[PDB]
Design a protein around this ligand. Structure first.
Ligand SMILES: [Ca+2]
Length: 279
């Protein structure tokens, strides 16, 4: 399949080169997989989600996304126009309030919620969780992310936006999950992107067009935007049978574009997520 005039990041993850505008992907499009977006919620009624999104948990007085951030991330995972995996099932877990923040105790509970809740959902091709969130280092937050991964979920987490070593941030620093840095359309490391030995992969994160609340769209930037590119890619590859939840991060690293990015410090992987779709 080919989607012309796609957001640059979709075009980038199916290309061996920057500077193109068509997204190419196998039409299976993540069908039969599930992606949890652990964030401010998802505006499920948005037509872009086509009935494939649903809120399953909140820790606040409402499950509504009153911010937009979670809706944007979910759109990059799985919206029809702005999504990597255009047929996946999306599940929203609202651990972040409408100001975009959450207590670590709530975020931990949300991760353990996903590890159990997947047993209530039909995901024959596998389960992914996208965590565009984080703060300072916490062994408890990292151990929750490790449990979620161990339970059979492909966990993708944002590296963080501190232009610093991700070793000092959580869940970014948990070794066993897939820690995602951000790049721009000219294949630079995004100026704010964290780096370091714990990074597994980079994805598009500067000037990313996706869904927003009120049935809208907007472009924003962050490692929060790179993470759902990788989560959606994992779901897509798991539907194709190329990999599994336990192995998808390594598979994505193995098959990534190598050496394309600039300003990667020594000791950090130079790897940009790529679907290797070859019609
Ligand atoms: Ca890792």
């Amino acid at each position: 399949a080919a989607q012309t005039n796609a957001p640059w990041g979709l075009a980038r993850i199916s290309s061996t080169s920057p500077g193109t505008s068509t997204y190419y992907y196998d039409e299976s499009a993540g069908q039969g997989s599930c992606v949890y977006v652990i964030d401010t919620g998802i505006e499920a009624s948005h037509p872009e989600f086509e009935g494939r999104a649903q809120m399953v948990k909140t820790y606040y007085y409402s499950s509504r996304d009153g911010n937009g951030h979670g809706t944007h991330c979910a759109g990059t995972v799985g919206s029809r126009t702005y999504g990597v995996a255009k047929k996946t099932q999306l599940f929203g877990v609202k651990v972040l309030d409408d100001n975009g923040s959450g207590q670590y105790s709530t975020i931990i509970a949300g991760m353990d919620f996903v590890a159990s809740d997947k047993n209530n959902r039909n995901c024959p091709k596998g389960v992914v969780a996208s965590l565009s969130l984080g703060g300072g280092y916490s062994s408890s937050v990292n151990s929750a992310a490790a449990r979620l991964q161990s339970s059979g979920v492909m966990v993708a987490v944002a590296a963080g936006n501190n232009n610093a070593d991700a070793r000092n941030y959580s869940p970014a620093s948990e070794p066993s999950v897939c820690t995602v840095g951000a790049s721009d359309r000219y294949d630079r490391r995004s100026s704010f992107s964290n780096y370091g030995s714990v990074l597994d992969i980079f994805g598009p994160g500067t000037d990313i067009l996706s869904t927003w609340i009120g049935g809208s769209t907007r472009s924003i930037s962050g490692t929060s935007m790179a993470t759902p590119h990788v989560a959606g890619l994992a779901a897509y590859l798991m539907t194709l049978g190329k990999t599994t939840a336990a192995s998808a991060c390594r598979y994505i690293a193995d098959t990534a574009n190598k050496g394309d990015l600039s300003n990667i410090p020594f000791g950090t992987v130079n790897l940009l997520a790529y679907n290797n779709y070859q019609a």
